[PDB]
């Protein structure tokens, strides 16, 4: 999901990034503390500001 978000931010389509982000949230509960959670968040935050 992260690599996909890294491609979709460079390609620049706002729509797909929003769906990717919601779909990634469901998985989040059983994750511990990783780097991946900030990377995914980072795109979500920007889309929220828009």
């Amino acid at each position: 999901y992260a690599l996909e978000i890294q491609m979709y931010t460079a390609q620049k389509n706002n729509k797909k990034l929003k769906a990717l982000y919601e779909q990634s949230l469901h998985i989040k509960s059983a994750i511990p503390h990783p780097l991946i959670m900030g990377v995914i968040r980072e795109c979500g935050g920007k889309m929220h500001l828009r």
């Binding site: 729509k15 929003k18 779909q23 469901h26």
Partner: protein, 433 residues
């Protein structure tokens, strides 16, 4: 009127089956230039699907359009040889054949339905009723398709099976042209699968049933002239459905949800529903004209907004469902816009006001007079030097005068009652003897 900057190609392509032929014929009727191409696009589509009636009727209008000296289509090829674009004529064999095959087809489907009734498996009976139902819609027979689907109903055994049928029934109900049936059946469909689920069908749902039903309701209400409610149901429709080639193309939802909101909505509602919404946002993006219109109206950009608005007007008027509403909504956008202008200004200069609404001072004067009397704008024109002022209402003057007046009429009715009671008690009324 005319305005040929309605892309004919897109309007055809975005539709299919009966809805396409029907719509195309509406636009050909209202616009002069666009008619010719519309009749050919209609005829190419009518040759497929298999319907006889449209072929006779559309070809009849084409036979007027060429043959007369009124139109320019008689001397247009200046001789009829063969070519490739050449006005066609009726084919005596095609019209019998289409009907013959349609009828023959119906018989195959009936024979199939008969064994499914014999086998007594409910789902096979229901599928049959769908197969007979769908054929009646290709041949052109509007009524019989609804009867087939009605029968389908007591063979249900799942929330999905109810959903398929109601949508199918909705397809038919548009052609009968009664909107109230769409609302009963959409509600029925919405209620049946757990009030449109309770989980999002897990992560997401493959095809949004939710989006189809709101958009059908929104079309029904627009027409009803329930306009505020029509924007309200429709905005929630998303691009999930992708396209609808048997009820409402995705271009028209953007137009409908925008223009239908702008007329009747106040500022709080505009920001909350049309602007902040992720859902409507794909639609706003789809055509920038609808979007620019909303912001420009909101920003007090009325001069840019109305200029884009007149240009679009005649195009939106060629649209079948949308056309009687253009005038009603446009008036509502202007009279709301007039209030909306006077809210921040105690004292406004009329020349700026006139220029913003794109009418002359004189015209604008007569519109305002109407708003002061009928409408709520408590303002007075100083027409001497053209300044719009600046009436302060007084909560006291209106209550005191009313209390005193109300007191006169209360007493008078009481006096009137004593006189009524007086003849009744001593028992006289008018008599001929």
């Amino acid at each position: 009127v005319e305005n040929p900057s309605l892309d004919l190609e897109q309007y055809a392509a975005s539709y299919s089956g009966l809805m396409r032929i029907e719509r195309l014929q509406f636009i050909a009727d209202h616009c002069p230039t666009l008619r010719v191409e519309a009749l050919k696009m209609a005829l190419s589509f009518v040759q497929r699907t298999f319907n006889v009636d449209m072929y006779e009727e559309i070809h009849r209008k084409l036979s007027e359009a060429t043959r007369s000296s009124l139109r320019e289509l008689q001397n247009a090829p200046d001789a009829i040889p063969e070519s490739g674009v050449e006005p066609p004529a009726l084919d005596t064999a095609w019209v019998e054949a289409t009907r013959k095959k349609a009828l023959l087809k119906l018989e195959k489907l009936d024979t199939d339905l008969k064994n499914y009734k014999g086998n007594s498996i409910k789902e096979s009976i229901r599928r049959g009723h769908d197969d007979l139902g769908d054929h009646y819609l290709d041949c052109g027979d509007l009524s019989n398709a609804l009867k087939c689907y009605s029968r389908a109903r007591d063979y249900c055994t799942s929330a999905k099976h109810v959903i398929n049928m109601c949508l199918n029934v909705i397809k038919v109900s548009v052609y009968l042209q009664n909107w109230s049936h769409v609302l009963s059946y959409v509600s029925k469909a919405e209620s049946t699968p757990e009030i449109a689920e309770q989980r999002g069908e897990r992560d997401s749902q493959t095809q949004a049933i939710l989006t189809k039903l709101k958009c059908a309701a929104g079309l029904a209400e627009l027409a009803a002239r329930k306009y505020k409610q029509a924007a309200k149901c429709l905005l929630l429709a998303s691009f999930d459905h992708c396209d609808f080639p048997e009820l409402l193309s995705p271009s028209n939802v953007a137009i409908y949800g925008g223009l239908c909101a702008l007329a009747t909505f106040d500022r709080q509602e505009l920001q909350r529903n049309v602007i902040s919404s992720s859902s409507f946002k794909l639609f706003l993006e789809l055509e920038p004209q609808v979007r620019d219109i909303i912001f420009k109206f909101y920003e007090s950009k009325y001069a840019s907004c109305l200029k884009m608005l007149d240009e679009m007007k005649d195009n939106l008027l060629l649209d079948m469902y949308l056309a009687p509403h253009v005038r009603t909504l446009y008036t509502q956008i202007r009279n709301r816009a007039l209030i909306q202008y006077f809210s921040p200004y105690v004292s406004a200069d009329m020349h700026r006001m006139a220029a913003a609404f794109n009418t002359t001072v004189a015209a604008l004067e007569d519109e305002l007079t109407q708003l002061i009397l009928e409408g709520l704008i408590s303002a007075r024109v100083d027409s001497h030097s053209k300044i719009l002022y600046a009436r302060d209402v007084d909560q006291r003057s209106t209550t005191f005068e009313k209390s005193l007046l109300m007191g006169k009429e209360f007493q008078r009715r009481a006096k009137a009652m004593m006189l009524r009671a007086a003849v009744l008690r001593n028992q006289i009324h008018v008599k001929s003897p």
